[PDB]
């Protein structure tokens, strides 16, 4: 009951000549795959672990100033000299202070002054990098059966976890009773970890863009330092004051942790405390059903009473789940299940948990089906004690069409060109659409990188207005389309 009730669940239907289908797995989503004569399976990317990180840079968020010293030079006599100014561990600045007989100098005028203080780091945020070949994606594959899922969450016989790494392009999962499943996932194109940094500040971590991380205006260490005392730009974390031009002072600016939390607004939080593992991103996989057979097809059928132990529950995805218990003999058998009209002339809806069987006859079976819009009747068992449970599905096929179109648009806005690989068979139209999407997305991401959703909306409005007031009818249509897409992306961004 995990892929049922995630609310980010996609039904990929059918395979291609070859028995393979293309699915993109996201961390917060689920993929349930249905093919004719094939068992329904639930796919879930549940972990992405980055191994063997290398620190790219170390930033200073909280510093302290000690050993402050100053030196002065009388006017016209050049610059003051501080011995500390030879130690890069000291932050220094030069200024001018008016001098004279009163200030202990000789001639009158602006005498140079240099103040120095030992910069020390109290708290730092470490940015780490990983090679794409050191990523490990954990994918759970559970056969969509009514079997009791597991003794507990810790160890589940029902679910089969496979680890996907760039080292092997093929991963096999032995689903007991169903054959084997072949996952051929592309870990090199889900996230580009050559442009990404793993930034941990203080028991919190984020997945940030590498250039953004290197453009941060904070003091930093090279990451190969090992000494931790030679910071590159310490002036960003101190302020020198000469208010009246008669005294130079230096103070430390204060902890930059809240400022860094503000700066991290658009990043995705990850876990780096133990293991350096994160839960964001997708994984394009080619699922091969060549060696997936149904389970318990040699069982005959159940000739006995079925009782509903949990009332029919409507799922977030237009599907109903029925929990039934078997009371008859011949314990391992196939549950007679169908969704028909009132007169039972026609089959109206399809079963999601294909080939349902009762194994022990004491353990109930959660059957999931997709009933039709309107009135349907779930017929369970044979006529001697046959169950007939009415159901009404509140919706329409046009509403489902609109919702699916919106879901696909959102997926395209999230996965970009990878959206064409989702549930895709190796069709010509899908390939050409993906090529066009790649080109258009390259142009769009060149034109809109580093802008906020409000800027996106303003630009979309401007472009759509320009298209509306365009002499060319083709230019008008093209500009209006670009503006509408830009407005949609601005609305659907920052998530």
């Amino acid at each position, epitope marked *: *009951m995990r892929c049922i009730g995630i609310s980010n669940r996609d039904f990929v239907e059918g395979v291609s000549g070859g028995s393979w289908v293309d699915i993109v797995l996201e961390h917060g989503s689920c993929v349930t795959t249905m093919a004719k004569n094939k068992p329904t399976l639930d796919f879930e990317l549940i972990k992405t672990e980055a191994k063997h990180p290398a620190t790219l840079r170390k930033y200073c968020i909280e510093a302290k100033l000690t050993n402050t010293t100053t030196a002065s030079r009388c006017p016209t006599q050049g610059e003051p000299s501080l011995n500390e100014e030879q130690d890069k561990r000291f932050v220094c600045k030069h200024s001018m202070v008016d001098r004279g007989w009163g200030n202990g100098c000789g001639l009158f005028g602006k005498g140079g002054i240099v103040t120095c203080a030992m910069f020390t780091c109290k708290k730092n945020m470490e940015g780490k990098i990983v090679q794409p070949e050191n990523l490990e994606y954990t994918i759970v594959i559970t056969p969509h059966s009514g079997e*009791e*899922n*597991a*003794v*507990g*969450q*810790d160890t589940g016989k029902h679910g089969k976890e496979i680890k996907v790494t760039p080292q092997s392009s093929i991963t096999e999962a032995e689903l007991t009773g169903y054959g084997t499943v072949t996952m051929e996932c592309s870990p090199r194109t889900g996230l580009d970890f050559n442009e990404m940094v793993l930034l941990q500040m203080e028991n919190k971590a984020w997945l940030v863009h590498r250039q953004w991380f290197l453009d941060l205006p904070l003091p930093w260490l090279p990451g190969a330092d090992t000494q931790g005392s030679n910071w590159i730009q310490k002036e960003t974390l101190v302020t020198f004051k000469n208010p009246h031009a008669k005294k130079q002072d230096v103070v430390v600016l204060g902890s930059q942790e809240g400022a860094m939390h503000t700066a991290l607004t658009g990043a995705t939080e990850i876990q780096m405390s133990s293991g350096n593992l994160l839960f964001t991103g997708h994984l394009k996989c080619r699922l091969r059903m060549d060696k997936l057979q149904l389970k318990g097809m040699s069982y005959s059928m159940c000739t006995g009473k079925f*009782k509903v*132990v*949990k009332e029919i529950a409507e799922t977030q995805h237009g599907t109903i789940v029925i929990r039934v*218990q078997y*009371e008859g003999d011949g314990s391992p058998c196939k549950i007679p299940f169908e969704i028909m009209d009132l007169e039972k002339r026609h089959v109206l809806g399809r079963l999601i948990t294909v080939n349902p069987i009762v194994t*022990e006859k*004491d*353990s*109930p079976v959660n059957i999931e089906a997709e009933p039709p819009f309107g009135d349907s009747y779930i017929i369970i068992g044979v006529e001697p004690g046959q169950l007939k449970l009415s159901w009404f599905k509140k919706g329409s096929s046009i509403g489902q069409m609109f919702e699916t179109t919106m879901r696909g648009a959102k997926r395209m806005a999230i996965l970009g060109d990878t959206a064409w690989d989702f549930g895709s068979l190796g069709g010509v139209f899908t390939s050409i659409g993906k090529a066009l999407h790649q080109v258009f997305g390259a142009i769009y991401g060149a034109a809109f990188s580093g802008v906020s959703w409000t800027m996106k909306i303003l630009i979309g409005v401007v472009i759509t207005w320009i298209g509306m007031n365009s002499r060319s009818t083709s230019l008008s249509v093209s500009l209006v389309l670009v503006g509408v897409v830009t407005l949609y992306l601005g609305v659907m961004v920052q998530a």
Partner: antibody
Framework: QLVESGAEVKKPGSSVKVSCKASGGTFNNYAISWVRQAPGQGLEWMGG????????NYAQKFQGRVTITADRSTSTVYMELSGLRSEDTAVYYC??????????????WGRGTLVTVSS | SVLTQPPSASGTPGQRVTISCSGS????????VYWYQQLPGTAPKLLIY???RRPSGVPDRFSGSKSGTSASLAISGLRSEDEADYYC???????????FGGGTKLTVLG
């Protein structure tokens, strides 16, 4: 892996809070429920909590007299019983289950805490 | 709505005894059944779950028997140590809360 509060003594018409520590792993992955054993008597189910969600459910015996809460900062689950009396004298247990609507196998049982109500 | 269990049971070493736990359809026969043994002064232990499954570490002598609306528990290879109070735990849809049987204090002539 579950630590419950030490032996306590109370008085009639009082409120007692019973605390159970967790392992952190069983705090956001399992559920916790409270069972009371009267002196020389059988087990009794008071209520349960799923710490990450926190919406507790209570037996009709104690509905309105008990309040179960979980401290997510300290991974602790608390049982408070108000309006105590002689009957409420019993040892109190906390155990964890799979947090599924159908799963109630209490594999890990708290060592228990004795609450005595007397004039 | 309340699980009914025999107050006590007796046996001899090597001679298994069966403990019955009967309830309504909503109580038992529609939900899993769990069996616990409670030694005096100690927390109850989970003997079997899902009406016949023994958690790892439970000796195979324990059997989980379930019926249409009643359940039974038996202890093969009875020993002096098995003497304890045995409870059947099962969520009952009616009463919307887990319910326990009256308990059974198995007696062994040690």
């Amino acid at each position: 892996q579950l630590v419950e509060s030490g032996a306590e003594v109370k008085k009639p018409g009082s409120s007692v809070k019973v605390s159970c520590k967790a392992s952190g792993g069983t705090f956001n992955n399992y559920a916790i429920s409270w069972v009371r054993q009267a002196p020389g008597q059988g087990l009794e189910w008071m209520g349960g909590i799923i710490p990450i969600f926190g919406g507790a459910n209570y037996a009709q015996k104690f509905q309105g007299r008990v309040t179960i809460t979980a401290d997510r900062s300290t991974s602790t689950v608390y049982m408070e019983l108000s309006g105590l009396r002689s009957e409420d004298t019993a040892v109190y247990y906390c155990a964890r289950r799979p947090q599924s609507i159908f799963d109630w196998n209490f594999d890990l049982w708290g060592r228990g805490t004795l609450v005595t109500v007397s004039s | 709505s309340v699980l009914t269990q025999p107050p006590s049971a007796s046996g001899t070493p090597g001679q298994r005894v069966t403990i019955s736990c009967s309830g309504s359809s909503s109580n038992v026969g529609s939900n899993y059944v769990y069996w616990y043994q409670q030694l005096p002064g100690t927390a109850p232990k989970l003997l079997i779950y899902r009406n016949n499954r023994r958690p790892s570490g439970v000796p195979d002598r324990f059997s989980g028997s379930k019926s249409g609306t009643s359940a039974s528990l038996a202890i093969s290879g009875l020993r002096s140590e098995d003497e304890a109070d045995y409870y059947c735990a099962t969520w009952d849809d009616s009463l919307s809360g887990l319910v326990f049987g009256g308990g059974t204090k198995l007696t062994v002539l040690g």
